[PDB]
Amino acid sequence: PSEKEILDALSKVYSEQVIQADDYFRQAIFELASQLEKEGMSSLLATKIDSLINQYILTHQFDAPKSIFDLSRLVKTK
C-alpha cells in the first residue's frame, strides 16, 4: 500500500467531475495530495484523508464514484 498508489488514488478522485464541481472537496483533496507529494505519507495524513473521505461518503449517502471508495479503501488499510 505505497505512497504513490495513494497519491494516484487522490488524483483519480480529484479529477472527478463531482469533486471538481465542489470547491471544498476539490481544494481539500488538492491540499492533501500536495502534502503527500511534498513530504510523503504519514499516520497523520492518512487520518486526514480518511476523515475527508468519510465526510464525503456520509455527506452523499454512499452515492460516490468508485474512485472515492477505492481511495477510502487504501487509506483505511494504512
Numbering used by the authors: 2 to 79
How is this structure described in the published paper?
In order to neutralize the toxic effect of the peptide on the "producing" cell the genes encoding bacteriocins are generally co-transcribed with a cognate immunity protein. These small proteins (typically 88-115 amino acids) interact very tightly with a specific bacteriocin or pair of bacteriocins and protect the "producing" microbe from the toxic effect of its own bacteriocin. Sp-PIP belongs to a large family of putative bacteriocin immunity proteins. A combined structural, genomic and proteomic analyses has allowed the identification and in silico characterization of a new putative immunity protein from S. pyogenes.
Here we present the first structure of the protein from locus Spy_2152 (gene names taken from S. pyogenes M1 GAS), named pyogenecin immunity protein Sp-PIP, determined at 2.15 Å resolution. The crystal structure of Sp-PIP was solved by the single wavelength anomalous diffraction (SAD) method using selenomethionine (SeMet)-substituted protein. The crystal asymmetric unit contains 78 (out of the 102) well ordered residues and 74 water molecules. The first methionine and the 23 C-terminal residues are disordered and cannot be identified in the electron density maps. The four long helices (H1, residues 3-16; H3, 23-41; H4, 43-61; H5, 66-79) pack tightly together around a well-defined hydrophobic core. One additional short helix (H2, residues 17-22) connects helices H1 and H3. In the structure, the N- and C-termini are very close together (7 Å). Overall, the protein is slightly acidic (calculated pI = 6.06) with two large acidic patches near each end of the bundle and one large positively charged patch near the N- and C-termini. The structural comparison results suggest that Sp-PIP is most closely related to Imb2, from subgroup C. These results suggest that Sp-PIP is highly likely to function as a bacteriocin immunity protein with similarities to proteins from group C.
